[PDB]
Design a protein around this ligand. Structure first.
Ligand SMILES: *[C@@H]1O[C@H](CO)[C@@H](O[C@@H]2O[C@H](CO)[C@@H](O[C@@H]3O[C@H](CO)[C@@H](O)[C@H](O)[C@@H]3O)[C@H](O)[C@H]2NC(C)=O)[C@H](O)[C@H]1NC(C)=O
Ligand SMILES: *[C@@H]1O[C@H](CO)[C@@H](O[C@@H]2O[C@H](CO)[C@@H](O[C@@H]3O[C@H](CO)[C@@H](O)[C@H](O)[C@@H]3O)[C@H](O)[C@H]2NC(C)=O)[C@H](O)[C@H]1NC(C)=O
Ligand SMILES: [Cu+2]
Ligand SMILES: [Cu+2]
Ligand SMILES: [Cu+2]
Ligand SMILES: [Cu+2]
Ligand code: NA
Length: 499
């Protein structure tokens, strides 16, 4: 069952074996992935998070981010540790009380403390639209049509060297899959469809690192949503999905009744499908209960290319139709050396006092804010352009901005910008050497918004900056509840920190 929009959510430690290998984890709602949190557009969500963690090897503090939800007027509820709050300590709880005006689509939630989400705290978050403009394109859209793609590690996250190329031990599809080494024939996930029906499949990358080449043997996929943004229909036979991205696609159950492989090939870790790694099963009602016998093609003739995507609504692009054609045009210098990433020469290390709390206490320019050199102020009611030229090791890097979606004016592997009708999204691959992936948005949401690579190992190694958007209006726009004001005193007391 789905939970929400008003619900408790307990965060616990437990042993799990999603690929046949037992390890302890950090779980929401007792499962991997966590339960789907759901509501309708414009609803009030009140997710009271109970921190019941006791195993220090995965951290006993926590904080949860609602990925892709704008949090307008509720910056304090966004979740990134030391940007918008101090962590929740064990034995305490915290009500994330916010609203979702003007958004409807496929989202997710995850820990936003250190690399803790890798240890299991990840789940889907769906905001349905009772008047969805795409409603007539499918018959079925429910918890059974969500497809999560996850990397899974046998080593605990706090034992992963910082700045290292860290590699997974299994791909999990809807929580199940097989290990790349010492492979055992542990259970695979089954997605069941009825011949003749059309399904809104909500594809969610909950990855900590790899991107996946996703396909379904015998089937194609008609994309209708990208990171919460409705798209024109685009039919493809393969989707390369980067960490934290989402797509809705229509699956037409129009092939013969039978069993078909679902494939998710990561860019690192096990290559291919031997022993049923990187796999799940699409089963038609009435098919024999047996593994598929289907083949992938040698090459995919209609793969997703990001520049083929266009919004369903006339969203356009803010600013003027040339590079630098914005009120505040930025170019970030994105680098890696010696185990640490940097942005504009500064490696991100979380501050002792969360950025939002520094601003509420009166610090009002970005040079007064800590960490020094890690906070860039943005002016209010302005068009922002951010060029993100690739080349830093460990690519391709999927960059994500909190508090906003953005027009993708230039995409990976294509030097031509699009100032007319590019897709809008919230997480974007910045591509490869020589690319100049560029995003635009307008500043109508006061508060500190994190910008970072969504490969969680890279964020931990410093690949982040904070956009302090409209510092002067942050306090008036974001009144804070007493329980939020209580978090840093409680956290610092528990950890013997002076502030
Ligand atoms: C990606 O696109 C951005 C623009 O969105 C390019 O930024 C431009 O970068 C050049 C240098 O590479 C800048 O010109 C330089 O400016 C300094 C003065 O600030 C001057 O001393 C240098 O001699 C040179 O003129 C320019 O200001 C900047 N913005 C623009 C043109 O709008 C960036 O180069 C692109 N990166 C890649 C890898 O393609
Ligand atoms: C590389 O990225 C560029 C920019 O996003 C892509 O260029 C765009 O290509 C589309 C599709 O061909 C062009 O739209 C076409 O326009 C004609 C004339 O209106 C229309 O009849 C077609 O039905 C279609 O709408 C679009 O104008 C063009 N934009 C720009 C700025 O060049 C390009 O396709 C990408 N390259 C690859 C290999 O995908
Ligand atoms: Cu996220
Ligand atoms: Cu986010
Ligand atoms: Cu990265
Ligand atoms: Cu984030
Ligand atoms: Na425009």
């Amino acid at each position: 069952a789905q939970i929400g929009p008003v619900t408790d959510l307990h965060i616990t430690n437990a042993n799990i074996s999603p690929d046949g290998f037992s390890r302890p984890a950090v779980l929401a709602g007792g499962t991997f992935p966590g339960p789907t949190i759901a509501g309708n557009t414009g609803d009030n969500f009140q997710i009271t998070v109970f921190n019941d963690l006791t195993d220090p090897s995965m951290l006993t503090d926590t904080s949860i981010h609602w990925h892709g939800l704008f949090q307008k007027g509720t910056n304090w509820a966004d979740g990134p540790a030391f940007v918008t709050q101090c962590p929740i300590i064990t034995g305490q709880s915290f009500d994330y009380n916010f609203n979702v005006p003007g958004q409807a689509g496929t989202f997710w939630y995850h820990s936003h403390l250190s690399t803790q989400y890798c240890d299991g705290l990840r789940g889907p978050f769906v905001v349905y639209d009772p008047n969805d403009p795409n409603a007539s394109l499918y018959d079925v859209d429910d918890d059974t049509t969500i497809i999560t793609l996850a990397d899974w590690y046998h080593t605990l996250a706090q034992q992963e060297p910082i700045g290292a190329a860290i590699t997974a031990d299994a791909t999990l599809i809807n929580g199940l899959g097989r290990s790349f080494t010492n492979t055992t024939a542990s259970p695979l996930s089954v997605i069941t469809v009825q011949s003749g029906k059309r399904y809104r499949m909500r594809l969610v990358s909950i990855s900590c690192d790899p991107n996946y080449l996703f396909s379904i043997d015998g089937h194609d996929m008609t994309i209708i949503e990208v990171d919460g943004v409705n798209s024109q229909q685009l039919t493809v036979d393969q989707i390369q999905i980067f960490a934290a991205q989402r797509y809705s696609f229509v699956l037409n159950a129009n092939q013969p009744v039978g069993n078909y492989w679902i494939r998710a090939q990561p860019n690192s870790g096990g290559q291919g499908f031997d022993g049923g790694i990187n796999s799940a099963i699409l089963r038609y009602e009435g098919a024999t209960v047996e593994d598929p016998t289907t083949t992938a093609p040698t090459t995919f003739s209609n793969p997703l290319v990001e520049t083929d995507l266009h919004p369903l609504a006339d969203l356009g692009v803010p600013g003027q139709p040339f590079r630098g054609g914005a009120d505040d045009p930025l170019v970030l210098n994105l680098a890696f050396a010696n185990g640490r990433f940097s942005i504009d020469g500064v490696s991100f290390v979380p501050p002792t006092v969360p950025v939002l709390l520094q601003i509420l206490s009166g610090a009002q320019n970005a040079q007064d804010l800590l960490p020094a050199g890690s906070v860039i102020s943005l002016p209010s009611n302005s068009v922002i352009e951010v060029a993100l030229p690739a080349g830093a090791a460990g690519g391709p890097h999927p960059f994500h901005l909190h508090g906003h979606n953005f027009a993708v004016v230039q995409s990976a592997n294509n030097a031509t910008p699009n100032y007319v009708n590019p897709i809008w999204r919230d997480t974007v691959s910045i591509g490869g050497t020589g690319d100049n992936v560029t995003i635009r948005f307008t500043t109508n949401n006061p508060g500190p918004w994190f910008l970072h690579c969504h490969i969680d190992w890279h964020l931990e190694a410093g690949f982040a900056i904070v956009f302090a958007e409209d510092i002067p209006d942050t306090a008036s726009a974001n009144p804070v509840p007493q329980a939020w004001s209580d978090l840093c005193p409680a956290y610092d007391q528990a950890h013997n920190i002076s502030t």
